[PDB]
Amino acid sequence: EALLEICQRRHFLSGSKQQLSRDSLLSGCHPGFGPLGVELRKNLAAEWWTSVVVFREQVFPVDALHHKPGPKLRENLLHGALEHYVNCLDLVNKRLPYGLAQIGVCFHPVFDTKGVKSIGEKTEASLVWFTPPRTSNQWLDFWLRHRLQWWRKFAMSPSNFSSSDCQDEEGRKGNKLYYNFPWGKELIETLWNLGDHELLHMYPGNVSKLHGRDGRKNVVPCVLSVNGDLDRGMLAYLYDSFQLTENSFLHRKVLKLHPCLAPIKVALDVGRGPTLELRQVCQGLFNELLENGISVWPGYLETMQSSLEQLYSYDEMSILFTVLVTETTLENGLIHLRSRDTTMKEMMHISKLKDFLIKYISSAKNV
Amino acid sequence: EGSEALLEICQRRHFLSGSKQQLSRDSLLSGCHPGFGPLGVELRKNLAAEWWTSVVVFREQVFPVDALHHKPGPLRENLLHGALEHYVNCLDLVNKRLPYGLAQIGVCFHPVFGVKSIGEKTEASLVWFTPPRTSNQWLDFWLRHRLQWWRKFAMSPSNFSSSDCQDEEGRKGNKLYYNFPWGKELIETLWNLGDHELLHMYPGNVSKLHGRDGRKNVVPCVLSVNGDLDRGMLAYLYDSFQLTFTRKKNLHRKVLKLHPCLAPIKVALDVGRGPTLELRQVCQGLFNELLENGISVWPGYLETMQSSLEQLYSKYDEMSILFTVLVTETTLENGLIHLRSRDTTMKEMMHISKLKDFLIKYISSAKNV
Amino acid sequence: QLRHNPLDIQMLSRGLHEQIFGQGGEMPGEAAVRRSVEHLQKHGLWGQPAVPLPDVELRLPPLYGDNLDQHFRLLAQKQSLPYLEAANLLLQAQLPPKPPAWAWAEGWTRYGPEGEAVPVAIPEERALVFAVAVCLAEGTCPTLAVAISPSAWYSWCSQRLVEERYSWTSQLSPADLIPLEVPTQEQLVVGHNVSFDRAHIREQYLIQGSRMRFLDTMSMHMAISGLSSFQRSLWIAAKQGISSWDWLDISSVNSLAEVHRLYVGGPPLEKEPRELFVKGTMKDIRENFQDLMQYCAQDVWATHEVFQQQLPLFLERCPHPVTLAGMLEMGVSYLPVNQNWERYLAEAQGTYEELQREMKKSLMDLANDACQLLSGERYKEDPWLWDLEWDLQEFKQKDQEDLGPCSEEEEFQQDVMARACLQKLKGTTELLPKRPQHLPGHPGWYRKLCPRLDDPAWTPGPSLLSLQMRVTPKLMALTWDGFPLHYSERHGWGYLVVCPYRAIESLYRKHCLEQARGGPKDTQPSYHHGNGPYNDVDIPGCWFFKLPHKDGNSCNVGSPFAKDFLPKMEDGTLQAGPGGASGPRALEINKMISFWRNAHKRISSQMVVWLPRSALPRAVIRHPDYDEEGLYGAILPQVVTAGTITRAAVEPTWLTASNARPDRVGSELKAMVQAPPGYTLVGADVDSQELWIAAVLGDAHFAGMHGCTAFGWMTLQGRKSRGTDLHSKTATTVGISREHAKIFNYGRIYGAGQPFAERLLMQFNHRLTQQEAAEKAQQMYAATKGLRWYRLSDWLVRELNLPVDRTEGGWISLQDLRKERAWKGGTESEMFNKLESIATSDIPRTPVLGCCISRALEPSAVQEEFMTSRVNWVVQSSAVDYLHLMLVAMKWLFEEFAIDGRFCISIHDEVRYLVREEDRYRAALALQITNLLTRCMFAYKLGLNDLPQSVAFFSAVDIDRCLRKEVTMDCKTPSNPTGMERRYGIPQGEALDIYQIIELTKGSLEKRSQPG
DNA sequence: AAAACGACGGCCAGTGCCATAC
DNA sequence: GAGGTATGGCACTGGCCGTCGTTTT
DNA sequence: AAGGGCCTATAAAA
DNA sequence: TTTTATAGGCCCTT
Ligand SMILES: Nc1ccn([C@H]2C[C@H](O)[C@@H](COP(=O)(O)OP(=O)(O)OP(=O)(O)O)O2)c(=O)n1
């Protein structure tokens, strides 16, 4: 689609036109992400971390190795969390319901007839939740609910994010999450009730080490594995931001990425006038916004060699607001502010700009 | 020695995972350690965040980049090659304004002497493309800045040292070391690599690689800054434990004086004796408020009362927690809570409404000191 | 062309001696030669080998008048004639009444006789009385100014005052400054501290020379009725509420109000009560525009009346034209800078901050540990921390099983319940005291060390800590020779609520293991030795001793971390409690950052004005070194032309700017003054200026020969390879090191006495017991400046007819009846006698230019009161006359031979000019010629025509691109580690001898004659 | 509910000591 | 009869005025 | 080693 | 948005 071309042009995705394809993107063998894509994925991972780890008192970070020493590569983050389970049980004084969360790259085989074999990478976010079996399935539903809401939290079309129920061979419940890409539904997150077979197999003998406290009685924990693909989630959000044509009333195109997820919040540029004065004012505003944690695209370093319409068509970069500083700003301090969502142009004083952006981001977060 | 007690504290306080034998100096330095505990992971996350804020966020010409872990694509040793590949594509970001950087933090794999194993080190790299006329100047700039960054969070900044070194091909470079109790260990390397690798990467038309040095077009010289964040975390852990004496040894308090920006847990919250329901309600409210403002809190109030206040203080000091917050029956009446600082071990009264603002101000100001 | 003095001293070349009108001079006598040779033999300084100097022959430029004195008089009169004419126009000027209301119009406005305000581009006037006002809050851009000219008033307003604008340029340009200079005829601007006003007129920042000069009422006030800093304290204390105070009613401090009181008198002038420019904002200035303009006009009027009174007095009191010409030349001084300056500032500040933070962290950590001593009450057992306040206060007053997950509504309700429950605590917060407490649960000293929370610049922990605080030596547990330190109120730092003397004794025993009134109760002796009072402070264990001080037992040590205690730290007498290198590192950091801590508020705030490409000359533009992306600008140092009683220049920043030092953070300050492309700095410092002035005065007083006295001989022909040099001879005669002899001589020559020498001897060798050392000092003095002989100067012969004692001179006899002081045989006695004669004359005047001393230092006002001040003033004002002579001669040579140059800076000894690269060598030759002419003028005014070849020419002129003591210095500093060359494209200059210069320039200053 | 008083703290001038230059 | 002439900063101390808590008819 | 050919990209503009 | 002007850069001229 044209969205892939825009991502190629606006440095969301790296590589050539042939290197970027539906099959290549889904397989994970694409050359890599552009800086904007890296920032979007970083924001998505931060949002995942804030909604899972700091959300619950019982969830801890964990570091798992990538190579699994012994003469292979990593496929999932479950093994590392299971390895750290016994050590981290002492962290909670064996209070059984607790989680280990980790975000990292896992590798899977990929190959095509056109042969040999290649290796694909997927950045996954994993939560391993050790819970008493009596409530284990209940907790599964809980996490399912939460995960679904999280996917719907930043989505323009949450109906594209769907949940399905599935059962194991031996009757273990689980849930799958899908996003409806234009060609069909694709799996983006998996929740499984794994019982305690992997954990027991990891410690043959000394099962007393794995006991966790649950109402003054000791039981071997049930393991819930939640695994989400942040790469495919970022791709899904990019496709969700490309809601057909642009706003207002040439059929140009805008990516209405969520304010919390948009890699760049505001773009700063100069008008016509004294270059030194305008660049000084823009540098000051840029430093102010960075010191206040607002990502800024420094367009004033290129002056305004391009036209205003092409400059706005930032919209392909999913920038929330565009700020233009002119010689008028040197007199009264008023700058031109264009919104991405509404395409409305406004006059605003610089003093209020940082506060307005912070309040806008905060309200977008709380909605 | 005090190194054994520091390792015992790290193992006990879940800074480092694995057994005592698995945490040998060779195992830790080689990168073949089993892995980090949650506190170690959080400390490394804070260190990487500070690196990103001091390299990426406050520079217009430095951009994030993701490099794959596997070289062939038919393993990774350093992050330089991916940035070198992305150089031409990312040149469009600055309209070929030559001095610009690509920064990345990621795990690299290094073979070591089964008979031979593989160690992992999460390293942070900045690849700085600069006009050749200013290459050495930029090298000095980055050397100074990186050394200052390492000394910024250090209790004994003199342990972080810089050395000048020469390439076998005659290329200048700088190395950074931390003085562990056993000697100096390399933690960061800055090299002026020229453009030979870049030219070899793009055979044929060299005009594709040209960047604007003001009004001139020149093939950039590549500056590679690569720091070991695992070894940096280990260095800061060793730096928090004062190995020094006299009255200091008379006090002999086991505390990890980690920098506020690097400390994995900022605040510890616990209840006293009294009506449990109201105290649990107020503590849950305060905990949610503090988390909502991005301040890490250790929920000690969820555990029952089995240790004394002194035991809690020693446990939190070994965890390098900046402040301890106590909610008593007094808080239900007048709202005052007890705040104990890690640095001075002194207790103070503070009202709950002011606590979040004070903590945020403390964390923000710690950088500005 | 080789001449020798009758004392066998290499003289000026016979070719050049006749060109300085040496032919037809006086012939030295024979009895004087006999006496001088006998004196040299008595001092053992006669018959020494002489190394011949290669004589210099070159066609000197034309010399006007009969003698050199008339030459300098003619040159200075020509240079200062137009400005004297303009000053007379101001003097004999009847001014109209100032307008009833001020313009409030951008730019300059001229007020007609009826008060009408007609806008003008610039005041079309040749002489003006000037006063510039700036809004300090807004930076350094001038806001408004007022000017008085003969029959005209002018007022200038800034666009930043008249126009309300959100943003103005942070980096000033000449367009922001105010215009005064008339384009192509020469102007004079008069003001009180006129340098500040000059720093705000645009045309003065151009690289090309400006015909406009400036006269400062402060400088003339110091010339006529000035006082020393000690005299300033005395005057201020007397007017607020030494035996003779007759000088009070004739001198005042340099403030414009009291200058108006002294010279004009009448109604007092009232200052601005709110100080809106200094403290208020631009809005306050706008709201009080008329009042502030009226105050500025009042300042202009007061300065005008003061100048009217001063100019006749100054011209009468400094009758030589060279003084006025040199003051005019010093008025305009130019410091070229580029963008690198800014970087320097940032770098310096950054370095400073880092070096500070480290230090503070160390100190802060100590404090964070000391609080633990309150837990065990062990602070009273601490040999250092028992003196502190450890008070504290209080605040003010009047297991289950797994329940599983929760419903979405359930967790929603739980979260909202928690938030609502937490809001109640904030509601309670608003009921407790309005004034918060500052660290109630912390000790008193730690509460003092921490910034208050409401402080806008707040940092966590005891960030107020510094090495200079009294608590800091206690926190580091500083130990002096096994002794804990202590602070006595009357006597500073020494080495020893109940004092833990048992702990102190245990600590001393541990230190010994590591390796005097005798009351055992309370105050105790030491069986150890040292200085200071002992038993004034009462301690239960009180082997108390003051720390040694470089300024004697009377003085006290204010901080153990002073730069002179680093050698004691390295010795090991002074040690740190934690041990290792914490103490040495702290003292190293203090040494590195002391200069910047003192001078950053000045160096950073220094005013730069950046010239645009249009203002840049074509020579600079068409040059390879011209970087179009770079910035080129200037700093005009705000020099008070005569800021001391000695009429020496005073500038807060650049006359005290430290030279490059490897440890001082900002020491590359003078190196940061870099010439623009196409220009270089040609400078030179006078070789032992004060020493040679003193020596030549002594030689002229003793005989008609050069080097006739022993001190003059030593100064002229000292050599470090063998003896016969001054410092080595002093060391040989006294018995101590040559460096100690040098410091002794340089301390003495400034009018010193017995206590200085005794203190230095005791500090150097404590092994020499007090009185013995004193005797040593006395002998030193008997060798340098012979013993005083009173010679009936208390009548005295009538009292002598008792008869008692013999001889026609006194023996410092004391009569104790209660009913011309000279010196004796010594190397420096003749010059001391000459200086005392000049000081004690009825109207002390400088021997060369005839400039008088202040009316507050005249003997008729200060009889036998300020003697050291006057004897030092003689030499220092002679040095100022030397500087004026050099400036006049250099200006004459430049304007005569079309050398494209400008006066850059003068720091007492040093003079540096900004010349073109083409004419740098001609400028160096001109500098050599000027030095020769000034030395010969000094010699002639004293009475001797010939001049020694040793001091005839400059040792070496420095052609460089920046201000450095030596052209070879790379200026490695903590803030400039990469070095000058590697940081900025500034290469090393070159030092040229007189022979090198003449070989390069063919001995001519003409562009046509210069080789190519 | 209005009036006297004591305690705590901030602002500015004075003093002592140290750091630069020539 | 005094090491001199300048510059300036920082730490410490004391005097004065505003505010707040406490105490009287 | 210079200055004088060739295309040739740049940036505010008549 | 050129077009002619401005410094870059590279091939050919004593
Ligand atoms: N670029 C410079 C730097 C310095 N000087 C001179 C001026 C000083 O007077 C002299 C230093 O003189 P000392 O006091 O150090 O004496 P000397 O070392 O020259 O004398 P002696 O040979 O007796 O040791 O350096 C100079 O002419 N040009």
| In contact, C588 and C569? CB cutoff 8 Å | no
Q: Could you tell me how many CB contacts below 8 A there are between chain B and chain C? A: 119
DSSP C348-402: HHHHHHHHHHHHHHHHHHHHHHHTHHHHTTGGGG-TTTSSS--------------
B325: which 2 tokens? Answer: 């917050």
Taking phi over 0 as left and psi of -120 to 50 as alpha, with beta for the rest, C464 belongs to: alpha
Through-space distance between the first and last CA atoms of chain B, rounded to whole angstroms: 32
Quick one: closest CA in A to B82, which residue?
Answer: A32
| In contact, C651 and C179? CB cutoff 8 Å | no
Distance CA(C446)–CA(C921), nearest Å, equals 63
Residue type at B172?
K
The alpha carbon of C955 and the centre of ligand 1 are apart by a number of angstroms equal to 9
Closest CA to C226 of C878, C854, C845, C867: C854
User: How long is the CA C749 to C1' D22 vector, in angstroms?
Assistant: 15
Distance CA(A207)–CA(A219), nearest Å, equals 10
Closest CA to A210 of A96, A61, A76: A96
Sheet holding A184-193, edge to edge: A59-61, A98-110, A118-131, A222-229, A184-193, A173-181, A161-167
Q: Across the interface, do C578 and B244 touch by the CB < 8 Å criterion? A: yes
Domain stops at, among A235, A262, A289: A262
C366: which 2 tokens? Answer: 């100590």
Task: Say whether both B292 and B193 belong to one domain.
Answer: no
DSSP A150-207: HHHHT-S-GGGEEEEEEE-TTS-EEEEEEEEETTEEEEEEEEEE-TTHHHHHHSSS-G
The residue whose CA is least distant from atom 15 of ligand 1 is C688
Q: Of residues 439 to 458 in chain C, which lie within 7 A of strand D by their beta carbon?
A: 452
- C96-104, long-range: CB < 8 A, 24+ apart: C96/C151, C96/C152, C96/C153, C98/C153, C98/C297, C98/C301, C99/C153, C101/C290, C102/C155, C102/C289, C102/C290, C102/C293, C102/C294, C103/C155, C103/C157, C104/C157, C104/C162, C104/C289, C104/C290
The DSSP call for residue C948 is: B
Using the atom order of ligand 1, give the atom closest to the CA of residue C909.
7
Q: Across the interface, do C404 and A139 touch by the CB < 8 Å criterion? A: yes
The DSSP call for residue C178 is: B
- When divided into structural domains, chain B yields a total of 2
User: How long is the CA A68 to C1' E9 vector, in angstroms?
Assistant: 63
Residue type at C1003?
G
Using the atom order of ligand 1, give the atom closest to the CA of residue C726.
23
Cα angle C563-C569-C571, degrees, rounded to a multiple of 5: 125
> Which CATH topology does C93-317 take?
Nucleotidyltransferase; domain 5 (3.30.420)
Which sign does the torsion angle of CA C125, C131, C133, C134 carry? Answer: positive
Domain stops at, among B245, B263, B281: B263
Q: Could you tell me how many CB contacts below 8 A there are between chain A and chain C? A: 48
Helix C68-91 to helix C920-942 angle (10° resolution) is: 100
Quick one: closest CA in C to B158, which residue?
Answer: C358
- Which residues does A274 contact at the CB level (< 8 Å), separation at least 6? A327, A330
Q: Among partner residues B248, B257, B288, which is closest to C415 by beta-carbon distance?
A: B288
Cβ-Cβ contacts under 8 Å, C977 against chain B: 144
Residues ending a continuous segment of chain C before a break (C–N > 2.5 Å): 184, 241, 398, 496, 515, 794, 819
Distance CA(C967)–CA(C683), nearest Å, equals 10
- The H or E element containing residue C782 is helix C770-784
Resolution (A): 3.4
Q: Which nucleotides in chain D lie less than 7 Å from some protein C-beta?
A: 9-10, 14, 16-22
What are the residue ranges spanned by the domains of chain C?
14-79+683-690+883-1001, 93-317, 712-876
| In contact, B39 and A62? CB cutoff 8 Å | no
| In contact, C681 and C912? CB cutoff 8 Å | yes
B354: which 2 tokens? Answer: 């002011």
User: How long is the CA C457 to C1' E22 vector, in angstroms?
Assistant: 34
Task: Say whether both B169 and B21 belong to one domain.
Answer: yes
Task: Say whether both B56 and B72 belong to one domain.
Answer: yes
Domain stops at, among A234, A262, A290: A262
B71 in contact with nucleic chain G (CB within 7 A): no
Helix (H, G, I), strand (E, B) or coil at C689: helix
* C688 pocket-lining for ligand 1 (C-beta < 6 Å): yes
Radius of gyration of chain B (CA): 24
Number of Cβ within 10 Å of residue A192's Cβ equals 19
Number of Cβ within 10 Å of residue C99's Cβ equals 20
Q: Is the peptide bond before C803 cis (omega within 30 degrees of 0)?
A: yes
Distance CA(C593)–CA(C358), nearest Å, equals 12
Place of tokens 């990469």: C978
Distance CA(C474)–CA(C467), nearest Å, equals 11
Smallest CA–C1' distance to E3, residue: C747
Q: Across the interface, do A214 and C408 touch by the CB < 8 Å criterion? A: no
Radius of gyration of chain C (CA): 34
Place of tokens 């520091």: B6
DSSP C707-753: T-SHHHHHHHH--SSSS-SHHHHHHHHHTS-HHHHHHHHHHHTTT--
Task: Say whether both A231 and A318 belong to one domain.
Answer: no
Taking phi over 0 as left and psi of -120 to 50 as alpha, with beta for the rest, A195 belongs to: left
| In contact, B181 and B3? CB cutoff 8 Å | yes
Cβ-Cβ contacts under 8 Å, C371 against chain B: 344-346
Closest CA to C889 of C61, C57, C56, C23: C61
Task: Say whether both A145 and A281 belong to one domain.
Answer: no
Each residue of A250-263: b (16+ CB within 10 Å) or e?
eeebbbbbbbbbbb
C933: which 2 tokens? Answer: 């002419």
Shortest alpha-carbon distance between residue B47 and chain A (Å): 15
The alpha carbon of C685 and the centre of ligand 1 are apart by a number of angstroms equal to 10
Distance CA(C115)–CA(C130), nearest Å, equals 19
Task: Say whether both A224 and A278 belong to one domain.
Answer: no
Task: Say whether both A26 and A124 belong to one domain.
Answer: yes
User: How long is the CA A306 to C1' F14 vector, in angstroms?
Assistant: 20
Using CA atoms, how far residue B244 sits from A85, B262, B318, C227, in Å, is: 36, 22, 18, 56
Q: Which nucleotides in chain E lie less than 7 Å from some protein C-beta?
A: 1-12, 19-22
* C720 pocket-lining for ligand 1 (C-beta < 6 Å): yes
Quick one: closest CA in B to C383, which residue?
Answer: B247
Closest CA to C243 of C818, C841, C820, C866: C866
C128: which 2 tokens? Answer: 């003006």
Residue type at C414?
Q
For chain A, the 3-state helix, strand and coil shares in percent, each to the nearest 5, are 40, 25, 35
C715: which 2 tokens? Answer: 């100064």
DSSP A86-128: HHHHGGGTTBS-EEEEEEEEEEEEE-------EEEEEEEEEEE
Solved with: X-ray
Using the atom order of ligand 1, give the atom closest to the CA of residue C967.
1
Q: Which nucleotides in chain F lie less than 7 Å from some protein C-beta?
A: 10-12
Distance CA(A282)–CA(A285), nearest Å, equals 5
Closest CA to C975 of C587, C595, C586: C595
Distance CA(B333)–CA(C386), nearest Å, equals 38
Distance CA(C336)–CA(C675), nearest Å, equals 5
Using CA atoms, how far residue B283 sits from B264, B302, C419, in Å, is: 21, 9, 10
Ramachandran angles phi, psi of A160, nearest 5°: -70, -25
Helix (H, G, I), strand (E, B) or coil at C831: helix
Q: How many contiguous H segments (helices) and E segments (strands) does chain C have?
A: 34, 20
* Overall residue count recorded for chain C in this entry: 1012
| In contact, B336 and C395? CB cutoff 8 Å | yes
Q: Across the interface, do C415 and B245 touch by the CB < 8 Å criterion? A: no
C401: which 2 tokens? Answer: 């099983």
Distance CA(C740)–CA(C748), nearest Å, equals 12
Q: Across the interface, do B97 and A301 touch by the CB < 8 Å criterion? A: yes
User: How long is the CA B60 to C1' F6 vector, in angstroms?
Assistant: 39
Strand B336-341 and strand C679-685: pairing? unpaired
Place of tokens 């951009």: B63
Q: What residue numbers bound the domain in which B367 lies?
A: 264-369
Q: Where are the alpha helices (DSSP H) in C430-548?
A: 444-449, 471-475, 501-514
Shortest alpha-carbon distance between residue A208 and chain C (Å): 19
Number of Cβ within 10 Å of residue C619's Cβ equals 17
Number of Cβ within 10 Å of residue A312's Cβ equals 19
| In contact, B349 and B338? CB cutoff 8 Å | yes
Cβ-Cβ contacts under 8 Å, A29 against chain B: 73
Task: Say whether both A180 and A273 belong to one domain.
Answer: no
Task: Say whether both B42 and B185 belong to one domain.
Answer: yes
Quick one: closest CA in C to B335, which residue?
Answer: C425
Rounded to the nearest angstrom, the gap between the alpha carbon of residue C365 and the centroid of all alpha carbons in its chain is 37
Residue A121 CB-half CA count within 13 A: 17
Distance CA(C331)–CA(C323), nearest Å, equals 12
Rounded to the nearest angstrom, the gap between the alpha carbon of residue C362 and the centroid of all alpha carbons in its chain is 33
Q: Where are the alpha helices (DSSP H) in C465-564?
A: 471-475, 501-514
A143: which 2 tokens? Answer: 């996490």
A87: which 2 tokens? Answer: 């050590």
Using CB atoms within 10 Å of the CB of residue B365, give its burial: 0 to 12 exposed, 13 to 18 middle, 19+ buried: middle
Number of Cβ within 10 Å of residue B311's Cβ equals 10
Residue type at B68?
L
Q: B37 CB near a chain A CB, below 8 Å? A: yes
Residue type at A98?
Y
Distance CA(C174)–CA(C205), nearest Å, equals 7
Distance CA(C599)–CA(C658), nearest Å, equals 10
The alpha carbon of C711 and the centre of ligand 1 are apart by a number of angstroms equal to 17
Closest CA to A157 of A132, A182, A194, A120: A182
* C687 pocket-lining for ligand 1 (C-beta < 6 Å): yes
Place of tokens 């013999």: C806
Task: Say whether both A355 and A215 belong to one domain.
Answer: no
Task: Say whether both B57 and B153 belong to one domain.
Answer: yes
Task: Say whether both B255 and B269 belong to one domain.
Answer: no
| In contact, C607 and C198? CB cutoff 8 Å | no
| In contact, B161 and B177? CB cutoff 8 Å | yes
The alpha carbon of C687 and the centre of ligand 1 are apart by a number of angstroms equal to 6
- CATH number of the structural domain spanning residue B285: 3.40.50.800
The alpha carbon of C950 and the centre of ligand 1 are apart by a number of angstroms equal to 13
- Which residues does B116 contact at the CB level (< 8 Å), separation at least 6? none
Which one of C162, C166, C171 would you mutate to disrupt binding with A, by most A Cβ within 10 Å of its Cβ? C166
C293: which 2 tokens? Answer: 């303009």
